[PDB]
Design a binder for these strands. Structure first.
Ligand SMILES: [Mg+2]
Ligand SMILES: [Mg+2]
Ligand SMILES: [Mg+2]
Ligand SMILES: [Mg+2]
Ligand SMILES: [Mg+2]
Ligand SMILES: [Mg+2]
Ligand SMILES: [Mg+2]
Ligand SMILES: [Mg+2]
Ligand SMILES: [Mg+2]
Ligand SMILES: [Mg+2]
Lengths: 261, 113, 151
RNA sequence: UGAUUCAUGAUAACUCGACGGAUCGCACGGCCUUCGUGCCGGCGACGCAUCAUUCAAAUUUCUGCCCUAUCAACUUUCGAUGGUAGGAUAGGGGCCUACCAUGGUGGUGACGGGUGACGGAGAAUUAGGGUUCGAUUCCGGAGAGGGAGCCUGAGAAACGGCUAC
RNA sequence: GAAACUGCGAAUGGCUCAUUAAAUCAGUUAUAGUUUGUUUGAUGGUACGUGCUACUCGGAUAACCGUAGUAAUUCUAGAGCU
């Protein structure tokens, strides 16, 4: 190709969008933004698909041009805007607030939060280093660059960021013994506790994690995102508290729930 | 005797209306016309104006005596004019239509000045 | 063979005809923008000094300055200049066009010549807004560099 | 950082510096110093430069491809393999130039030839193992009658752009 | 508000499978070997003043108006404005 591609064909769209294969030839093609477009959830799907607030393409545009939807504290009128993990979507007109979090099956879910727990987010640091005139600054994994961080915050750690003041308010030091929610691979959605980290010089670091219900698993460093200090997490969990289960467990769940109805 | 029975029904303040699935039952009838559906719906939802009501995508289930479709109740005439497509308003009688002819629709206008 | 006459100093223009040999000896073998004495064009032109610049020929090809040959050259010339004014033509586009040379000769049809000689509050608010932001940028600096300085 | 003369800072100079807002919308609304659109001051639009991010590309490592030996040597002066210094490029690199060395591939099939050969995801038949197919809607590549050269632009060697044959 | 200048886009999409057999391509790497309009976050002094808190405002072109050429074309020349 002689340049950038602007269409996303529906069969090539991410599998966790759950777009149906006969519903057209194209998919929304998330615009560039603070998330990598293969791990984001555009606003078209948040409004039209999940929340069923709109029935068509153009209805979503009619919603956005009216400045209702607010993403992480600012009003975003772009229709394919790449909202992502741990963002907040707010509709003040309905006074309703959602944190984007994973479910155990690896798909984004809009977990309702309160207005208290919507003025802040958590963000993992990509790196820390100096800038022009010796000023230190840190990178997040969603584009944000903060200058003059606490000189302790190192790479791969977590920070709490108030949306009002837009500065840090606390942080978690990435290390063994903290709760972490996996954001990639087959284990995405599963929360757990860091039990082991094994280094490998020249390759990816691997993390070994143990769920609260005992199930043990592992991932690589880039796919782990600490939530809280100690066993208690700092943010709300969705319908399942990040606990993966076998297919037989949910078969039992359906049939056992089929006797009360 | 026809009945009306709406489901999956939710009021949104973003587009200032309420959406629902109509599941009219008409034992003995062929099907319910959308105008009569409009009228009947007005007197369960008391709309003061039977022009903000829209119905579409009706199926008439195999075997008869049952029809489903989608229903929109607005709260203004203004909201229905901004939040509804033109052809739907034309169907409800709030607008008028035009046509096209594609040669010289732009082609020879390109080339004079 | 024909000549469009105009004067900007008043704003007039009209075209006239000549087919006399000796009437056009000092018309030929001379270039665009070259001053020509009106004495040869006739007795009706003394005091007038004519400035010849432009005027196409048969087939409607103009002249270009700098092609010193009464020929029909083929130049690859950029869009927007004289003799090529292509519209709907993709900035960066060039054409090889046919044009006649600068030196007036017999092969030309019509000459164009002229007559050298006849015989607020808003802006101020915007400016002070920009200034009031330039100041608070360094206000923010001295605030934010120092909160980190004492640590 | 697995790893850097790293990030980054100081210093001495340099450049005929791409740059560092002469722009546009509604809203009004505190208060006099000439009480003078008066001192202000907001919410936005567009635009300049740097870093990071995102959208990507370009090069790139390892392993893997059908038939043919009635195709056993092939490449190398003229770049073939490597070295040094350059030039060019967005950048690595014989990419190209100068000089120097004599290498490099090959019965584990090089080089050549055929392909009615774009590659893959896949398709048909399938006890198992297999055999054959894959122009075609998804991914990657390539082309726009055949070659070649370009301008514009962040991005094209573009063809519903240009120039030449 | 038409037209017109300015900006942007037209390098995506669509079609085809000719050339191409370590080539493309697939899984897997690398950039400490680079470019990246745009999105998003952060950021921005000194232009000369002998650095002692800023120092003035250009001409010219379309749309228009008008005289033409050529058999001809979003082929084209000259003049008056802004
Ligand atoms: Mg294409
Ligand atoms: Mg898009
Ligand atoms: Mg060398
Ligand atoms: Mg070199
Ligand atoms: Mg072929
Ligand atoms: Mg074929
Ligand atoms: Mg294709
Ligand atoms: Mg091409
Ligand atoms: Mg053909
Ligand atoms: Mg071409």
């Amino acid at each position: 190709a002689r340049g950038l591609k602007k269409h996303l064909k529906r069969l090539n769209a991410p599998s966790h969008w759950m777009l149906d294969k006969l519903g057209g030839a194209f998919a929304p093609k998330p615009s560039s933004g603070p998330h990598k477009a293969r791990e984001c959830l555009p606003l078209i799907l948040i409004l039209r698909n999940r929340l069923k607030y709109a029935l068509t393409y153009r209805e979503v545009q009619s919603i956005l041009m009216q400045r209702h939807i607010m993403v992480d504290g600012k009003v975003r009128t772009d229709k394919t805007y790449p909202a992502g993990f741990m963002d907040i979507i707010s509709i003040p007109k309905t006074g309703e607030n959602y944190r984007l979090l994973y479910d155990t099956k690896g798909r984004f879910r809009l977990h309702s939060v309160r207005d208290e727990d919507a003025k802040f987010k958590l963000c993992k640091v990509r790196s820390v280093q100096f800038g022009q005139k010796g000023i230190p600054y840190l990178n997040t994994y969603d584009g944000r660059t903060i200058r003059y961080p606490d000189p302790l915050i190192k790479a791969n750690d977590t920070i709490k960021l108030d949306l009002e003041t837009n500065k840090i308010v606390d942080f978690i030091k990435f290390d063994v013994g903290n709760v972490v929610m996996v954001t990639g691979g087959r284990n995405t959605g599963r929360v757990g506790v860091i039990k082991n980290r094994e280094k490998h010089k020249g390759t990816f670091e691997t993390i070994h994690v143990e769920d609260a219900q005992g199930h043990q698993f592992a991932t690589r460093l880039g796919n782990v995102f600490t939530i809280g200090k100690g066993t208690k997490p700092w943010v709300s969990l969705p319908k399942g508290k990040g606990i993966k289960l076998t297919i037989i467990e949910e078969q039992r769940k359906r049939d056992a729930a089929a006797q009360a109805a | 005797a026809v009945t009306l029975r709406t489901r999956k029904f939710m009021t949104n303040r973003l587009l200032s209306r309420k959406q629902f699935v109509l599941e009219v039952i008409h034992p003995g009838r062929a099907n319910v016309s959308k105008a009569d559906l409009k009228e009947r719906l007005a007197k369960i939802y008391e709309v003061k104006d039977s022009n903000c009501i829209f119905v579409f995508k009706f199926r008439t289930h195999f075997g008869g005596g049952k029809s489903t479709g989608f229903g929109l109740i607005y709260d203004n005439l203004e909201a229905a004019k901004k939040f509804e497509p033109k052809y739907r308003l034309i169907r409800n009688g709030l607008a008028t239509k035009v046509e096209k002819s594609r040669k010289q629709i732009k082609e020879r206008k390109n080339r004079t000045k | 063979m024909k000549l469009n006459i105009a004067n900007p100093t008043t704003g007039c223009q009209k075209k006239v005809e000549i087919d006399d040999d000796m009437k056009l000896r000092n018309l030929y073998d001379k270039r665009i923008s070259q001053e020509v004495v009106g004495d040869l064009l006739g007795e009706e032109f003394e005091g007038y000094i004519f400035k010849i610049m432009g005027g196409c020929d048969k087939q409607g090809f103009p002249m270009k300055q700098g092609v010193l040959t009464p020929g029909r050259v083929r130049l690859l010339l950029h869009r927007g200049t004289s003799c090529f004014r292509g519209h709907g033509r993709r900035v960066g586009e060039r054409r090889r066009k046919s044009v006649r040379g600068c030196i007036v000769s017999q092969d030309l049809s019509v000459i164009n010549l002229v007559i050298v000689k006849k015989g607020t509050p808003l802006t101020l608010q915007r400016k002070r807004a920009r200034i009031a932001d330039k100041k608070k940028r360094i206000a923010k600096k001295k605030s934010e560099a120092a909160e980190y300085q004492k640590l």
